[PDB]
UniProtKB/Swiss-Prot annotation, chain A:
This is Alpha-aminoadipate--LysW ligase LysX. Belongs to the RimK family. LysX subfamily. The lineage of its organism: Bacteria, Thermotogati, Deinococcota, Deinococci, Thermales. It holds the Pfam family LysX_preATP_grasp. GO terms for biological process: lysine biosynthetic process via aminoadipic acid; protein modification process; SOS response. ATP binds at residues 89, 129, 159-170, 184. Keywords: Amino-acid biosynthesis, ATP-binding, Ligase, Lysine biosynthesis, Magnesium, Metal-binding, Nucleotide-binding. Signal peptide: none annotated. It is an enzyme of class 6 (ligase).
Amino acid sequence: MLAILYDRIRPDERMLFERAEALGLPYKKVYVPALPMVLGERPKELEGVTVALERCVSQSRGLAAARYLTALGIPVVNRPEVIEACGDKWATSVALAKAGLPQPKTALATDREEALRLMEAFGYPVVLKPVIGXXXXXXXXXXXXXXXXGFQHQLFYIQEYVEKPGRDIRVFVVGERAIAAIYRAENCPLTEEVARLSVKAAEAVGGGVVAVDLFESERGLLVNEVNHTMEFKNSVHTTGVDIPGEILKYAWSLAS
Amino acid sequence: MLAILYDRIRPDERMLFERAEALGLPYKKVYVPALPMVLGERPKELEGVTVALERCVSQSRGLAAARYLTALGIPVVNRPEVIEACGDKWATSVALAKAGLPQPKTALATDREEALRLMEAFGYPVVLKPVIXXXXXXXXXXXXXXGFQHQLFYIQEYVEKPGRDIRVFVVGERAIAAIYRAENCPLTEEVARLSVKAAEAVGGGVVAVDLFESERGLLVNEVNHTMEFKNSVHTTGVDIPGEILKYAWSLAS
Ligand SMILES: Nc1ncnc2c1ncn2[C@@H]1O[C@H](COP(=O)(O)OP(=O)(O)O)[C@@H](O)[C@H]1O
Ligand SMILES: Nc1ncnc2c1ncn2[C@@H]1O[C@H](COP(=O)(O)OP(=O)(O)O)[C@@H](O)[C@H]1O
């Protein structure tokens, strides 16, 4: 049977429970915070589980649990590798580059002084984002100011400022299919071009269930971010697609 | 040519430079803190580099650079996957479990209350370590002490050790030396075999495997991605640096 791992119940999780009940798909709810994860001994709460859907709000918690499941030999929708490859912007941009996919000119610095040289070499304005878990720099003074105020110790994610003739698009990918999209809201009727780029980006980080955010730039479509635990409460009505049901079925088909 | 990535120069790095010079192995030093890492455009400092040895003291820095090198299509000794699989104790224990290797009974909690239940279920005394260093005597001590590593508690059983801790230096598919954490521990087929498998379990490459000689036999404790060896060279009389440089150079691409 299917196991839905969670910590805080959001409308998205609520919708997941309801669809599984209507679909007649065997499952059980598993509250992670209280789950004993001892290597070598399967917990009572996991008795009879053949596949799991990792739905925790906390990234660190969700990744730790996903890793435990792989140790118990239970398949988990969105493998550890995918979850970490997504929550780390530098990890994600590196994967898109290796896969030869289009994205904004991007760079990384490991100290404050090097960050400045790059921003200067890029030319203002420029953007700076946190590597884990959002600001346009106007000039050198603003740069210095922002830079002053685990594996993510002193890292600076620098990106070019993109001019956008169109609105940002968000595509919901399930396995090898793009099933819905929106303008970040109106429904964005999927086109073969958008669908194609989205699936490749999903594949570039390892496959699974992700939401790909794109920019409609003057250079064309560019990949911006890839999320490992997509939110969709509003998107269901906006697009009219049964996002939760598609997610549950995909997961169930990997049962082992 | 080979590229040695570094930030702070320690005796270990000093020894690496010297051995490369004596071996007649083409290389160049690369100061990471000042290296421009822009996706899509290879830096001047990397011109002519066919393979790299990641030697930064900072983990976050070393891992970020190793990733960049994979994007430029340059092989790096100790791939990103190995580096992170090593610097994360929960990640490393999970990998040893999947490979069916012996280790101390281990568990992980995601909140303070669950940590206590486990310590209690394990029985005192118990050990607690940072995921990325303290023995708990009883419940009172437990209560007192209590990015992707937010609020995680690594709990391990207290192991009785009739022997001394051993450290093995693994290069590829070979265990080349060992020591008692110091005397030289003449490698035995048993120790060498367990060490190579642990190295393979996290992805392979160049690592140091620390073992416990417990009452249940040999148990794997930790696997380090950037092994230190200045003292070990004399203690064991083995050319650790030269073995490391050759291994890397053989992966040239
Ligand atoms: N490099 C960039 N150039 C111009 N605008 C950007 C850039 N990166 C992000 N933005 C803008 O920042 C906002 C959201 O940024 P982001 O941190 O990437 O999160 P998300 O896109 O998932 O909401 C959007 O309005 C987006 O268009
Ligand atoms: N589970 C354990 N039981 C008893 N002693 C331990 C245990 N884990 C670690 N130690 C002791 O802790 C010290 C070092 O611990 P550790 O954090 O694993 O780093 P390292 O072994 O790489 O030096 C050693 O004296 C070791 O024997």
